[PDB]
């Protein structure tokens, strides 16, 4: 009931989670997810990311790492706790490690 998880990622990443049972339509027929294709621009990704931050329905947002780099300014600009954002490795992009927002918040971690 309480909170949904929003997913912004590529076709395979979003498909996997949807089968994972997470993700649904809102009462206004809006979807708490975005599939990011090669033809999707920066403004559309950022507008979606922000709108989730301004929605109380979501909370945890799941994004691909390569996306985190595409709209990185929007990830550091908002510092709160609702929008817990987790950065995950895409099917082909390799294991994430660097440029993690949280790893940066703490500068005492290997």
């Amino acid at each position: 009931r309480g909170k949904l998880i929003a997913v912004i990622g590529d076709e395979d990443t979003v498909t996997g989670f949807l089968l994972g049972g997470i993700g649904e339509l809102n009462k206004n027929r809006h979807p708490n997810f975005l599939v990011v294709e090669k033809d999707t621009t920066i403004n559309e990704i950022e507008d979606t990311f922000r709108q989730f931050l301004n929605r109380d329905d979501i909370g945890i947002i799941l994004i691909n790492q390569y996306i985190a780099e595409m709209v990185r300014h929007a990830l550091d600009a908002h510092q709160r706790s609702i929008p817990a954002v987790l950065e995950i490795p895409s099917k082909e992009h390799p294991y994430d490690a660097a440029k993690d927002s949280i790893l940066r918040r703490a500068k005492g971690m290997f």
Binding site: G2, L4, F17, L19, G20, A84, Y95
Partner: protein
């Protein structure tokens, strides 16, 4: 602990991503149906408070709402691979839920 979890997340998501490849191999193009045919969630997250010390911290808790996921045997009837795929990502979500709580 958050670092070890981040490390584990890598391995778990890798396995889930591979499982998707197998489901696609058998089924063909199931991603189109899954993405378009979305209505209600089976997984939802309930907020809970953890009194770690004088400071009170917000923690997420996994809630298995119970609404059934879509059953798809339409393409090559690749049901078993999709069923294993559901399980692998289901587990992935549970790890990620824990992960979000740890960022707190």
């Amino acid at each position: 602990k958050i670092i070890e979890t981040k490390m584990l997340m890598g391995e778990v998501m890798r396995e889930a991503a591979f499982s998707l490849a197998e489901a696609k191999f058998t089924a063909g193009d199931f991603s189109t149906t899954v993405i378009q045919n979305v209505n209600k969630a089976q997984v939802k997250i309930r907020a809970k408070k953890d009194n770690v010390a004088g400071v009170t911290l917000p923690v997420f808790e996994h809630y298995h709402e119970g609404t059934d996921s879509y059953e798809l045997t339409g393409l090559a009837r690749g049901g078993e691979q999709l069923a294993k795929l559901k399980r692998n990502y289901a587990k992935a979500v549970e790890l990620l839920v824990e992960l979000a709580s740890l960022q707190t």
